[PDB]
Structure 1
Amino acid sequence: VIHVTKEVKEVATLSCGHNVSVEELAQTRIYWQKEKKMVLTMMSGDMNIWPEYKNRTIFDITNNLSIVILALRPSDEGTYECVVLKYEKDAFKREHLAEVTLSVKADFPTPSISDFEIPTSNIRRIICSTSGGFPEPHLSWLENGEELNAINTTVSQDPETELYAVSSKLDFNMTTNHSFMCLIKYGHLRVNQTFNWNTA
Structure 2
Amino acid sequence: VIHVTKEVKEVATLSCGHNVSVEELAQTRIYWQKEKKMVLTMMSGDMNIWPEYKNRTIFDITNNLSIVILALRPSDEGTYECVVLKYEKDAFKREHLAEVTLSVKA
Cα deviation for residue 52 of structure 1 reads 1.1
Aligned residues: 105
What's the TM-score, normalizing by structure 1?
0.51
Cα deviation for residue 45 of structure 1 reads 1.2
What's the TM-score, normalizing by structure 2?
0.95
Q: Which residue of 2 aligns with 1:23?
A: 23
Q: Deviation digits for residues 72-131 of structure 1, max 9, x if unmatched?
A: 111110000000000111111010011011001xxxxxxxxxxxxxxxxxxxxxxxxxxx
- Greater helix share, 1 or 2? 2
Which 4+ stretches in 1 moved above 4 angstroms?
none
Q: 1:20 & 1:38 partners in 2: Cα distance?
A: 20
Report sequence identity in percent.
Answer: 100
Highest Rg: 1 or 2? 1
Q: Which residue of 2 aligns with 1:56?
A: 56
RMSD of equivalent CA atoms: 4.0
Cα deviation for residue 35 of structure 1 reads 0.9
Q: Deviation digits for residues 104-162 of structure 1, max 9, x if unmatched?
A: 1xxxxxxxxxxxxxxxxxxxxxxxxxxxxxxxxxxxxxxxxxxxxxxxxxxxxxxxxxx
Q: 1:24 & 1:47 partners in 2: Cα distance?
A: 16
Q: 2:74 & 2:45 partners in 1: Cα distance?
A: 32
Task: Identify the structure with bigger relative contact order (alpha carbons < 8 Å, sequence gap 6+).
Answer: 2
Q: 1:3 & 1:46 partners in 2: Cα distance?
A: 30
Q: 2:42 & 2:102 partners in 1: Cα distance?
A: 22
